[PDB]
Design a protein around this ligand. Sequence first.
Ligand SMILES: *[C@@H]1O[C@H](CO)[C@@H](O)[C@H](O)[C@H]1NC(C)=O
Ligand code: NA
Lengths: 253, 29, 30
Amino acid sequence: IVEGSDAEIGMSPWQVMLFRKSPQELLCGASLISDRWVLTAAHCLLYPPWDKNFTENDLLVRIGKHSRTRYERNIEKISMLEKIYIHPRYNWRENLDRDIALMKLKKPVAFSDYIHPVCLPDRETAASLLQAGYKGRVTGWGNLKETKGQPSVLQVVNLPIVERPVCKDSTRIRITDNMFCAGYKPDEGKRGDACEGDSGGPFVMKSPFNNRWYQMGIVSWGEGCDRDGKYGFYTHVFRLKKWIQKVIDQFGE
Amino acid sequence: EADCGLRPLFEKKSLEDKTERELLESYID
Amino acid sequence: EDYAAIEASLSETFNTAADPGRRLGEGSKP
Ligand SMILES: *[C@@H]1O[C@H](CO)[C@@H](O)[C@H](O)[C@H]1NC(C)=O
Ligand code: NA
């Protein structure tokens, strides 16, 4: 996260760390959506140009974390994956369209002060909150600036959603309906962006209707981090909600 | 989950984090 | 495999992997 701040304890209890077994390394962020299921970005798992193709046994997820590096005893939970499901039409060749993946834990994880699932948006919640100027929140342990710059604890930044045609005109990459962008504009004075290692983490908004946190986006892509006139792009979770439900139903709640 | 999106250390205790107000403010003004 | 104390095999000093999501288009790096 560029230009964010340290998270408060328990601020984002759905935040998941995707951790490589060998060699040990932070891969990506992710989010807990039930006691068995974790949502992340497809490109965190599969990116053929870099020969990236992680399977279930290559990875672990770490849940309930605050410190980036320390084993947080009696706080974090470490789970192995039973299965990974990547969207069939994920588009690694061009713009990471449908940059979404689901991971099923081998065993259910117990909830606590530090571990708690986020909500997925319904139609009305998405229609209400996904509007230009409305801010969502992004969290992660990714780099503090465009490429050490590694944070010691979880970072958080609040960012305004941007109008589709501004997102459109800001980049030469083809934008689809399955993405939205966010961040401040050059003239807004404030700044901030997700950055490397934040991918697959959640973009969340707090609903004024029921005071629940909903995951509207998945940190997906950008051209560098925090450049003036550039914005961060997020997988549109509601647009993909049907596929998420299909997978969970078919492969076990 | 019927309990999703409600944080044990915040919503469940009627506490707000240091910046969630910023989100709500953006929805209103 | 794991219980509580045996996580002394867990590194507390590790890198963050290169993230291709930030290297699209003008984000390219050498
Ligand atoms: C990724 O790797 C797995 C295991 O080596 C392999 O079975 C699978 O076909 C690969 N996926 C593709 C098509 O890149
Ligand atoms: Na920017």
